[PDB]
Enzyme design. Structure first.
Site, short mmCIF file in Angstrom:
data_model
loop_
_atom_site.label_atom_id
_atom_site.label_comp_id
_atom_site.label_asym_id
_atom_site.label_seq_id
_atom_site.Cartn_x
_atom_site.Cartn_y
_atom_site.Cartn_z
N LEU A 1 14.86 -10.63 2.41
CA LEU A 1 14.34 -9.37 1.86
C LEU A 1 15.24 -8.76 0.79
O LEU A 1 14.75 -8.11 -0.14
CB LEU A 1 14.11 -8.34 2.97
CG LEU A 1 13.06 -8.68 4.03
CD1 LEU A 1 13.10 -7.66 5.16
CD2 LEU A 1 11.65 -8.77 3.45
N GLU B 1 16.84 -10.38 -1.44
CA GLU B 1 16.67 -11.17 -2.66
C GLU B 1 15.71 -10.55 -3.66
O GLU B 1 16.05 -10.37 -4.83
CB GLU B 1 16.13 -12.56 -2.31
CG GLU B 1 17.06 -13.41 -1.45
CD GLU B 1 17.97 -14.33 -2.23
OE1 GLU B 1 18.11 -14.14 -3.46
OE2 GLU B 1 18.55 -15.25 -1.61
N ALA C 1 -4.56 3.86 6.77
CA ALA C 1 -4.50 2.58 6.11
C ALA C 1 -3.31 1.80 6.60
O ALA C 1 -3.44 0.61 6.95
CB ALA C 1 -4.39 2.77 4.62
N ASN D 1 -7.72 -6.20 5.93
CA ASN D 1 -6.47 -6.03 6.68
C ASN D 1 -5.91 -7.38 7.07
O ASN D 1 -4.71 -7.61 6.92
CB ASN D 1 -6.68 -5.12 7.88
CG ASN D 1 -7.01 -3.69 7.48
OD1 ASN D 1 -6.83 -3.28 6.33
ND2 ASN D 1 -7.52 -2.92 8.44
N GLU E 1 -7.83 11.63 -5.77
CA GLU E 1 -6.99 10.46 -5.55
C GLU E 1 -5.99 10.29 -6.68
O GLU E 1 -4.83 10.03 -6.41
CB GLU E 1 -7.85 9.20 -5.41
CG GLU E 1 -7.29 8.13 -4.48
CD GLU E 1 -8.32 7.05 -4.16
OE1 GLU E 1 -9.05 6.61 -5.08
OE2 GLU E 1 -8.40 6.64 -2.97
N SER F 1 -1.06 4.20 2.04
CA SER F 1 -1.90 4.28 0.85
C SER F 1 -1.25 5.23 -0.13
O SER F 1 -0.44 6.06 0.28
CB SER F 1 -3.29 4.79 1.20
OG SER F 1 -4.05 3.78 1.82
N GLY G 1 -0.32 9.30 3.63
CA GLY G 1 0.15 8.11 2.93
C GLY G 1 0.94 8.44 1.68
O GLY G 1 1.89 7.75 1.37
N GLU H 1 -2.73 13.07 12.21
CA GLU H 1 -3.83 13.31 13.16
C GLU H 1 -3.75 12.25 14.25
O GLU H 1 -3.23 11.17 13.99
CB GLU H 1 -5.20 13.28 12.45
CG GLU H 1 -5.82 11.90 12.25
CD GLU H 1 -7.17 11.95 11.55
OE1 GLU H 1 -7.42 11.09 10.67
OE2 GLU H 1 -8.00 12.82 11.88
N1 LIG Z 1 -7.06 -1.97 2.73
C1 LIG Z 1 -7.36 -0.90 3.50
N2 LIG Z 1 -7.46 0.30 2.87
C2 LIG Z 1 -7.74 1.42 3.57
C3 LIG Z 1 -7.93 1.33 5.01
N3 LIG Z 1 -8.19 2.58 5.42
C4 LIG Z 1 -8.17 3.39 4.34
N4 LIG Z 1 -7.93 2.69 3.23
C5 LIG Z 1 -7.77 3.21 1.86
O1 LIG Z 1 -6.82 4.27 1.90
C6 LIG Z 1 -7.23 5.32 1.02
C7 LIG Z 1 -7.55 6.57 1.82
O2 LIG Z 1 -6.35 6.96 2.47
P1 LIG Z 1 -6.14 7.04 4.06
O3 LIG Z 1 -5.03 6.11 4.48
O4 LIG Z 1 -7.46 6.94 4.80
O5 LIG Z 1 -5.71 8.57 4.20
P2 LIG Z 1 -4.46 9.01 5.09
O6 LIG Z 1 -3.24 8.22 4.71
O7 LIG Z 1 -4.80 8.92 6.56
O8 LIG Z 1 -4.23 10.51 4.56
P3 LIG Z 1 -4.96 11.80 5.16
O9 LIG Z 1 -6.08 11.38 6.07
O10 LIG Z 1 -5.37 12.53 3.91
O11 LIG Z 1 -3.87 12.50 5.93
C8 LIG Z 1 -8.47 4.81 0.31
O12 LIG Z 1 -8.09 4.17 -0.92
C9 LIG Z 1 -9.04 3.83 1.29
O13 LIG Z 1 -9.86 2.85 0.66
C10 LIG Z 1 -7.79 -0.01 5.63
O14 LIG Z 1 -7.94 -0.18 6.86
N5 LIG Z 1 -7.51 -1.05 4.83
MG LIG Z 2 -5.95 9.98 7.83
#
Ligand SMILES: Nc1nc2c(ncn2[C@@H]2O[C@H](COP(=O)(O)OP(=O)(O)OP(=O)(O)O)[C@@H](O)[C@H]2O)c(=O)[nH]1
Ligand SMILES: [Mg+2]
Ligand SMILES: Nc1nc2c(ncn2[C@@H]2O[C@H](COP(=O)(O)OP(=O)(O)OP(=O)(O)O)[C@@H](O)[C@H]2O)c(=O)[nH]1
Ligand SMILES: Nc1nc2c(ncn2[C@@H]2O[C@H](COP(=O)(O)OP(=O)(O)O)[C@@H](O)[C@H]2O)c(=O)[nH]1
Ligand SMILES: Nc1nc2c(ncn2[C@@H]2O[C@H](COP(=O)(O)OP(=O)(O)O)[C@@H](O)[C@H]2O)c(=O)[nH]1
Ligand SMILES: [Mg+2]
Lengths: 428, 426, 426, 428
Positions: free
Chosen positions: D243, D245, D12, D219, D174, D131, D137, D62
C-alpha cells in the site's frame, strides 16, 4: 502458423458460411459443439481445453438469418461476439448498406476483425462471402473492403461473389447495385471469384439428376469449391498453392481481377459407379462450358490465366499430360501474350462429402480458377440493363433519399465503360 | 579434410534436398537418429565432408533449410530423416513469396536472409576447410529463385574463392507449372551466370520421360523424380567421400568442363536405369552404361544433345572396373559421333572412377555434359519473356515490390548475350 | 583459509540470494538441514569460504538477509533451504520503503542499518581471514537500492582493504517495472562508482531473451532467471572453493579487469546453454563454449558489445580441459575480432581453469566482460533522469524524506562524467 | 505483521464494505460467524480461540443501513463497537456531515480507530470507502480525514470514491458536495481511486450480458478491484506491491492524486468458454475506453502513471511483452516527462468468485490503476454544474443554516479552478 479469416456478409454470405463451416467441421472431425475427440488451426482457434472456434465473422444488418445460426445445430460452434446483427436491413439498397445503416455497425465489426487478427501469428488474409445484388452484400461490403485496405493494406483480400444471372434474377434494382459495388470495390479488391446461381442450378439438374435444386444444394456445392481453394492451407500436399499465390498468378492487370470457378466431377452415385473418373477425364470436363459455374460463353472468349487445383489420388505426370492435351485442343484458346497459362496445385486429401449430400464420394477432384475475356460479355449485358433503367431515372430517388448523389451513378457508369474497354483491349 | 555446405531453398529445394540427405545417410550407414550402423570403414573415413559429429557417436548434416513459409519445414521435420537435421538450421519466414521473385529477392527474403547468412557463416567457421556450397532450388518460384539467388550472391561476397554449385530445376518446354515462370527463371538466370561456378540443369519433364520410358513406371511420384536427382548429386561428389583409381572432386570437374566462365550450365545424366522386368535381359557391363549415358532419352534436361555439340563431357564411374575398357569406350564413342563434339577441344571427355559402387548395384555412372544445345532452353524462355514484356503483363506485381523495368531489360540482355555466346562456339 | 560474507538486500536481493545459496549447497553436498551428504573430499576441503560449522556436523551460510518488509523474509524461511539460514541473520524492518530510495537510504533503512552492521561485524570477527563481501540487490527499488547502498558505504568504512562485490539487477531498456526507476538507479550508481570494487550488471530483459531464444523456454519463471544469475555467481568464486590448473580469485580477477578505478561495471555471461531438444545436436568442446561466450545473444546485460570495445575480458572455465586449446582459442577470437578490443591493452583476455565442473555437466564457462558499450545503459538512464528533473516530477516524494535537490544534481554529474570517461577510452 | 484498517462511511461505503468483507471471508475460508476450520491476519484480528474479526470500522449518521448488517448473515462477523451509528442522517448536506451532525460522533469513531491501531504491530495505513455526493460520505469523511492526519500523519491514506456521473445522478446538490469535499480533503489524502456507477452499469450490460444490473452487482464488481489491490498484502506473489508503494508510483505532484481503476476480464460463463484469456489479451482490454470504470475519454488525454496488478496463472515475460506492445501503440499516449510509466505487480492467487455471482471463474485477472489528464474533463463538467447553480444561489441557504458561510463556497470554487489549471499545465 499461417491463418485465414472468413467474413460472411448478408443473407447469401451467411448461408454460404453455414455450409462451409459445416464442411470444415466434417473434414477436421470437429463436432457442432467445437469439441474433437494439426493444420485445422489455420481456420480454428483453440480455447482452454477441447474446444475449437472458427476464425470467422458473420455480419447482417437484420437479425433473422443470423438468429437461425444462434438457435441452430452449430450455436455452440461460434463465439457470440463474432455473430453481428443490426436491427433494420439494407432493403436491396446500396446506399443504406454503404451509408445510412452500415455506418452504424461497421466500427464494431472492424474491432472484431482486429481482435481476430491479434490472435494470428502469420495472417495470410481474408475471404469475404457476399452477394453483389443485396443492399448489405453490396453497400456494406464495399464500405468494409475500403476500411480493410486502410487498416491492413498489404494483406491479400479475396471475394466470393454471387454474380447476377442474365435471365434469372430476384431484385429489380440488382443492376444498379452491381454496378455501384463494382465501382467502389474495384481499387480495394485483389481478386474476386464469381459464381452464378443459374449455372449451378443447371449443373445440378443436368449432372446430378436433381429435379428441384434448393439454395441449400447450391450452398453445399459452393462449399466444395471453397474447400478445394483452401485445402492447400488446411492439409499437406505434393505441390501446393497458398492464398498469396492466386493474386500473382491470376491477375495480369490490376482492374482485371475477376477469375471464374469450375468444379469437377459433380455426379451422383448412379453415374459414379459406371465411370472411370481419371485425371485426364476430370480435367477435360472443366474446359467444356456446360460444367462451368457462371453462365457465359468461353468459346467466344480467350483464356488469360488458368489455375488448376487437384485433390485426392492424383499423380503429377498424368496432370501434366492432361494440360498438354488441353493446350493442343484448338477450341480452347489462350491470349497470345501468355505462353504459360497454367498454375497447378496438387493436394493429397480426397474431397470429404457431407452425410445426406447430393454428391457421390470420389477418389479425385479439381477446382479450376480461370480468367477469361468472356467476362466482358457478362459485364456488357449488366451495363445495358443499367443504362435502360437510368434513362428513365427509375428507382433513382430511393438512392438519393439515403444520401447518394446522381453524379455517383454517372461515375459508376463511366468506370464500367472503362473496365469493358480494358477487357476488350487485352483481347486484341 | 574437405567439407561441403548444403543449402536448400523453397519447396522444391527442400523436397529434393531431403531425399538427397536420405540417400547420403543410406550410403554412409547413418540411420534417422544420427547414429552410424554401417559396416565398412570406408563409409566413415570421409563422413566429415557432409556430416558434423555432434558427440555421443551421432552425426548431423551440414545442411541449412530455408523457406518463406513454415509448412514445408514442418513436412520435412515430420518426414523419415526429419529428426537427423539440426533444429537451429531450419530458417523459416511466416509470409511466403507467392511465386514472386521480387518478394524472394528484395522483400520477404531480404528480411530473413541475414539470419540464414549468419547460420551459414557459423557452419563455415566450424568446418576446417570448406570446398564450397551446394544449393538445391527451382528457378520458377519465388523463394528458391529470388531468395536462393540472393543467398548465392551474399555467400560469394564472403567466400569468393570457394566453389559455388547449384542444382536448379528449370521450366519445362511443354507444360508450365506457374504463369510468371519465365520472369522468375530469367531473373534467376541473370544472377546465376555471374555468381555460380556451375549449374546442373534439371528438368521435370525429362525426369517424367525417364520414369515412363526407361524405368517403366506407370505412376511416377515427385519423390521418385527427386530420387534420380539425389542419385546424380551423390555421383557428382563420390570422389570426395570414397577412394578410387582416378579421382576428380568438384574443382577438378569444373576446370575440366568450363572452358569460358559463363558457359557453366550442365545437362546431367545417370546410368544405368532398368525396369523390374528388364533387369534380367541385359548384362551389367561398361558398354551398356556408356550407351545409356550417350543417349537423348537418358538426359535430365529437356534438350536434344544432337541439336548442338558437346564442348566437354565428364563421366564419373562407380564400382570395380577396368580402366582400359573405360578409356577405349570413351574414345570409341567420340570417334563414332565426331559430329556432336566441338573440333577445337581435342579429347572432349574427362573420366573419373570411384571404387565404391552405390548400394544394391555392382556398377554405376554419372554423366555431366556441357552441350551448346542448352541454348534452346534459354531461347524458349527468352522469347516468352519478351512476349510477356511486350504487353507489360503481370509487371505491377513485381514493380509493386520495388523492382524497376530497367532490371528486366538488363536480365533480357544478359539472356540474349548468353545464347549468342553459345551460338558462336557452336 | 579465505572467507566470503554474503549480503542480501530487498526483495530481488533476497530472491536471487536464496537460489544462489541453494546452488552452493548442491555443489558442496549440503542438504536443507545443514548436514553434509556429499561424497568427494574436494566438496568439503574449502567449505569454510561460504559456510560456518555450527557443530554436530552441520553447516550454516555466512549470509545476512536484510529487508524493510518481513514478507520476503517469511517467504524465504518457508522455502526449500529456508531452514539452513541462521535465524539471527534475518534482519527485517516493519515499514517498507515503497520503491523510494530516500526511505531505504536516509529514513527507514537508517533506523535498521545499525543492527545489520553489527551482525556483519560479528560475522567478520568469527571468520579468520575475510576476502570480502558480496551483495545481491536491485538498483530500481527502495530497499536493495537505498539501504543496500548505505550498507556498502558503512562496510567500506570499517573494512577499507577488503573486496566489495555487487550483483546488481539494473533497469532494462524496453520495459520499466517502476515509475521512479531512473531516480533510484541513478542515486545507487552514484554511490556504487565511489564505494564498490566491482559490479556485475544483470539485466532481466537479457535473461528473458536468453530463456526464450537459447534455453527454448516457453514460460520462463523469475526462479529460472535467478538460476542463471546464481550459476554466474558460482562460476565467479569457483577458484576459491576448488583446486585447479590456473587459479584466479576475486582480487586477481579485479586487478586483471579494472584498469582505472571507476570502470568496474561488468557484463557477465555464462556458457553453455542448450534446450532439451538441442542437447543431442552439438558436441561439448571448448570451441562451442568460446562461441557461446563471445556472442551478444548470451550477454546478461542489455547492451550490444559490438557497439563498443572490450577493455578486458576474464574467462573462467570449469572441467577437465586442455589449457593449450583454451589459450589458442582465446588468441584466435581476439585475432578474428580485433576491432572489438581496445588496441592499447595487448592480450585483453585473462584465463582461469577449475578442475571441478558444476553438477550434471562435463564442462562450463563464465565470462566477465568490461566493455565500453555499458555506457549506452548509463546514457539511457541519464537522459530519462534529466527529463524527469526538467519537470521536477515525483521530487516531493524524495524531498519529503529530507533529501535536497543538490544531491540529485551531483548524482547526475557523476553519471555524465562516467559516460564521458567511457567514451574517452572508446 | 503488516496490517490494514478499513473504514466504511455512509450508505455507499457500508454497502461496498459488506461486499468486500464477504469476498475476503470467502477467500480466506472464514465463515460468517468468524470461525475457520496465515496472511489473512493483515485484515482479520484473532480473539481467544477459533474466531476472526475484521480490522474494520463502519460509520453512518443514520441507523437503517448498518442495522441491516447487525441483523443480517454477517452479524457475528463484526464486533458491535466497530459498527457506529448516530440517529439523524446528513440529508445530502456536506455541512451536516462536516459540522452539525458529524461533530457529535467523530470523537467516538476516532477512539475506535485508535483502539484498532493499538492491536497493530506494523500498521500500513487506512482504506476509506465513501461517496463524494452524500452528506455523510462527503462532510463526515472530510472531517475524519483531517482528524486522521493530525493523529497519525505519516501513515498512508487511500480513498475509494463513487465519483458522480455526467448524465446519470441521484442528488440535486451533488455538485456542491463534490466540490466542497474535494477542497477540504485535497491536502489530507495521499491517493484517491475514483469509480463511476454509469461505467460499471454499461460494462455489466455490454460485457456481462446483464439486462438489469442492481447496486449489489456493482458492489460485487468493486469488491474484486479491492481484492486485486490488497492481494499483494493478503497473499505471497512473484513480484508484489504494498500500500505504501502506490502513492510514490502514481502521484507525480501532491494535488494530482486521482488515479482511476479498471478491471479485466469481466465476462460471463457464456463468453468465457469461447475465449483464450491470455495475458496479452487481458492487458490490451484495459487500455480500451469501453472497459474502464469511469465515464471519460482517455483517447483525449495522456497517461502519466500506470500501475498493473496481475493475479493468478501469470508469468513475467508475457506481461513485459504486453507492456512493450502497449507502449508501441500510438493511440495510447504517455506524457513526455515520464519515459517509465509502468509499475507492475504479479500475484499467484487467481480471483476467487462469490457463489451466485455474475462473473465467471478465470485463470488470470488484472487491475489497472491509471493516472490521466482526461480527469480534467470530468472535473470541468462538475465545475460548470456548480457554477450554474451558484449563479442563482440555489440551495445555498440550507448550507448556511448548518453553519457554513458563502465565502467557503467561493474558496472551494477557487481551489477547483486552481486544480484544473494544474491539470492542464502538466499536460503541455
Ligand atoms: N456503487 C454504489 N453506489 C452507491 C450505493 N449506494 C449509494 N450509492 C451512490 O452514492 C451516492 C449517494 O450517496 P449515499 O452514500 O447514499 O449518501 P450518504 O453517504 O449515506 O449521505 P447522507 O445519506 O446524505 O447522509 C449516489 O451517487 C449513489 O448513486 C451502492 O451500494 N453502490
Ligand atoms: Mg445515507
Ligand atoms: N447461392 C446463393 N445465393 C443466394 C442465397 N441467398 C440469396 N442469394 C442471392 O443473393 C441475392 C440477394 O441478396 P441477399 O443476400 O438476399 O440480400 P442481402 O445481402 O441480405 O441484402 P439486403 O437484404 O438487401 O440487406 C440474389 O441474387 C439471390 O439469388 C443463398 O443461400 N445461396
Ligand atoms: N523435381 C521436383 N520439382 C518440384 C517439386 N515441387 C515443386 N517442384 C517444381 O518447382 C516449381 C514450383 O516452385 P516452388 O519451389 O514450389 O516455388 P517456391 O516455393 O516459391 O520456390 C515447379 O516447376 C514444380 O514443377 C518436387 O518435389 N520435385
Ligand atoms: N532477477 C530478478 N529480478 C527481480 C525479482 N524480483 C524483483 N525483481 C526486479 O527488482 C525490481 C523491483 O525492485 P524490488 O527489489 O522488488 O524493490 P525493493 O524491495 O524496494 O528493493 C524490478 O526491476 C524487478 O524486475 C527476482 O526474483 N528476480
Ligand atoms: Mg438480407
Amino acid at each position: 502458423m499461417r491463418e485465414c479469416i472468413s467474413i460472411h456478409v448478408g443473407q447469401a454470405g451467411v448461408q454460404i458460411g453455414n455450409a462451409c463451416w459445416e464442411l470444415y467441421c466434417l473434414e477436421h472431425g470437429i463436432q457442432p459443439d467445437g469439441q474433437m475427440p494439426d493444420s485445422f488451426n489455420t481456420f480454428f482457434s483453440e480455447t482452454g481445453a477441447g474446444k475449437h472456434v472458427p476464425r470467422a465473422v458473420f455480419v447482417d444488418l437484420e437479425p433473422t438469418v443470423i438468429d437461425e445460426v444462434r438457435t441452430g445445430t452449430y450455436r455452440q460452434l461460434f463465439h457470440p461476439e463474432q455473430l453481428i446483427t443490426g436491427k433494420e436491413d439494407a432493403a436491396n439498397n446500396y446506399a443504406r448498406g454503404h451509408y445510412t445503416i452500415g455506418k452504424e455497425i461497421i466500427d464494431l465489426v472492424l474491432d472484431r476483425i482486429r481482435k481476430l487478427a491479434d490472435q494470428c501469428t502469420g495472417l495470410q488474409g481474408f475471404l469475404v462471402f457476399h452477394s453483389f445484388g443485396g443492399g448489405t452484400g453490396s453497400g456494406f461490403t464495399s464500405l468494409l473492403m475500403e476500411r480493410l485496405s486502410v487498416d491492413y493494406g498489404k494483406k491479400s483480400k479475396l471475394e466470393f461473389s454471387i454474380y447476377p444471372a442474365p435471365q434469372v434474377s430476384t431484385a429489380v434494382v440488382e443492376p444498379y447495385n452491381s454496378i455501384l459495388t463494382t465501382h467502389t470495390t474495384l481499387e480495394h479488391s485483389d481478386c474476386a471469384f464469381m459464381v452464378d446461381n443459374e449455372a449451378i442450378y443447371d449443373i445440378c439438374r443436368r449432372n446430378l439428376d436433381i429435379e428441384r435444386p434448393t439454395y441449400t444444394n447450391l450452398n453445399r456445392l459452393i462449399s466444395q469449391i471453397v474447400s478445394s481453394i483452401t485445402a492447400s492451407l488446411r492439409f499437406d500436399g505434393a505441390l501446393n498453392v497458398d492464398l498469396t499465390e492466386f493474386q500473382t498468378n491470376l491477375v495480369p492487370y490490376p482492374r482485371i481481377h475477376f477469375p471464374l470457378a469450375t468444379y469437377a466431377p459433380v455426379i451422383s452415385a448412379e453415374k459414379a459407379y459406371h465411370e472411370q473418373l481419371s485425371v485426364a477425364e476430370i480435367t477435360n470436363a472443366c474446359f467444356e462450358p456446360a460444367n462451368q459455374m457462371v453462365k457465359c460463353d468461353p468459346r467466344h472468349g480467350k483464356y488469360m490465366a488458368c489455375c488448376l487445383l487437384y485433390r485426392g489420388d492424383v499423380v503429377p505426370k498424368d496432370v501434366n499430360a492432361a494440360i498438354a492435351t488441353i493446350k493442343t485442343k484448338r477450341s480452347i484458346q489462350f491470349v497470345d501474350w501468355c505462353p504459360t497459362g497454367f498454375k497447378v496445385g496438387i493436394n493429397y486429401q480426397p474431397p470429404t462429402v457431407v452425410p445426406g449430400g447430393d454428391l457421390a464420394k470420389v477418389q479425385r477432384a479439381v477446382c479450376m480458377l480461370s480468367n477469361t475475356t468472356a467476362i466482358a460479355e457478362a459485364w456488357a449485358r449488366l451495363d445495358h440493363k443499367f443504362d435502360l433503367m437510368y434513362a428513365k431515372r427509375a428507382f433513382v430517388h430511393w438512392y438519393v433519399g439515403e444520401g447518394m448523389e446522381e453524379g455517383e451513378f454517372s461515375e459508376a457508369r463511366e468506370d464500367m465503360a472503362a473496365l469493358e474497354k480494358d477487357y476488350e483491349e487485352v483481347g486484341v | 579434410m574437405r567439407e561441403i555446405v548444403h543449402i536448400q531453398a523453397g519447396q522444391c529445394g527442400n523436397q529434393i534436398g531431403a531425399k538427397f540427405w536420405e540417400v547420403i545417410s543410406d550410403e554412409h550407414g547413418i540411420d534417422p537418429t544420427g547414429s552410424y550402423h554401417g559396416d565398412s570403414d570406408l563409409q566413415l573415413e570421409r563422413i566429415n565432408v557432409y556430416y558434423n559429429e555432434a558427440a555421443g557417436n551421432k552425426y548431423v548434416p551440414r545442411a541449412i533449410l530455408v523457406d518463406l513459409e513454415p509448412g514445408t519445414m514442418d513436412s520435412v521435420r515430420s518426414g523419415p530423416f526429419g529428426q537427423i537435421f539440426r533444429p537451429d538450421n531450419f530458417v523459416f519466414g511466416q509470409s511466403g513469396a507467392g511465386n514472386n521473385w521480387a518478394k524472394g529477392h528484395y522483400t520477404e527474403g531480404a528480411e530473413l536472409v541475414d539470419s540464414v547468412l549468419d547460420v551459414v557463416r557459423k557452419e563455415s567457421e566450424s568446418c576446417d576447410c570448406l570446398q564450397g556450397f551446394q544449393l538445391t532450388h527451382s528457378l520458377g518460384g519465388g523463394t528458391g529463385s529470388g531468395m536462393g539467388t540472393l543467398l548465392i550472391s551474399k555467400i560469394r561476397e564472403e567466400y569468393p574463392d570457394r566453389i559455388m554449385n547449384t542444382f536448379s530445376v528449370v521450366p519445362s518446354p511443354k507444360v508450365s507449372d506457374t504463369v510468371v515462370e519465365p520472369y522468375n527463371a530469367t531473373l534467376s538466370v541473370h544472377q546465376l551466370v555471374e555468381n555460380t561456378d556451375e549449374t546442373y540443369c534439371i528438368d521435370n519433364e525429362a525426369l517424367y520421360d525417364i520414369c515412363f520410358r526407361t524405368l517403366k513406371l506407370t505412376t511416377p511420384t515427385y519423390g521418385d523424380l527427386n530420387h534420380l536427382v539425389s542419385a546424380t548429386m551423390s555421383g557428382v561428389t563420390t570422389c570426395l567421400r570414397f577412394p578410387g583409381q582416378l579421382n576428380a572432386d568438384l574443382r577438378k570437374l569444373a576446370v575440366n568442363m568450363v572452358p569460358f566462365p559463363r558457359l557453366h550450365f550442365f545437362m546431367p545424366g545417370f546410368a544405368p536405369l532398368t525396369s523390374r522386368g528388364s533387369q534380367q535381359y541385359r548384362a551389367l557391363t561398361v558398354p551398356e552404361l556408356t550407351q545409356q549415358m550417350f543417349d537423348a532419352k537418358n538426359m535430365m534436361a529437356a534438350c536434344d544433345p544432337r541439336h548442338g555439340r558437346y564442348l566437354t563431357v565428364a563421366a564419373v564411374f562407380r564400382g570395380r572396373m577396368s580402366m582400359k575398357e573405360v578409356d577405349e569406350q570413351m574414345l570409341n564413342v567420340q570417334n563414332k559421333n565426331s559430329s556432336y563434339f566441338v573440333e577445337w577441344i581435342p579429347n572432349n571427355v574427362k573420366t573419373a572412377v570411384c571404387d565404391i559402387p552405390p548400394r544394391g548395384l555392382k556398377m554405376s555412372a554419372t554423366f555431366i555434359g556441357n552441350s551448346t544445345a542448352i541454348q534452346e532452353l534459354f531461347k524458349r524462355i527468352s522469347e516468352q519473356f519478351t512476349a510477356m514484356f511486350r504487353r507489360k503483363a503481370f509487371l505491377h506485381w513485381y514493380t509493386g515490390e520495388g523492382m524497376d523495368e530497367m532490371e528486366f531489360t538488363e536480365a533480357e540482355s544478359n539472356m540474349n548475350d548468353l545464347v549468342s555466346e553459345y551460338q558462336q562456339y557452336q
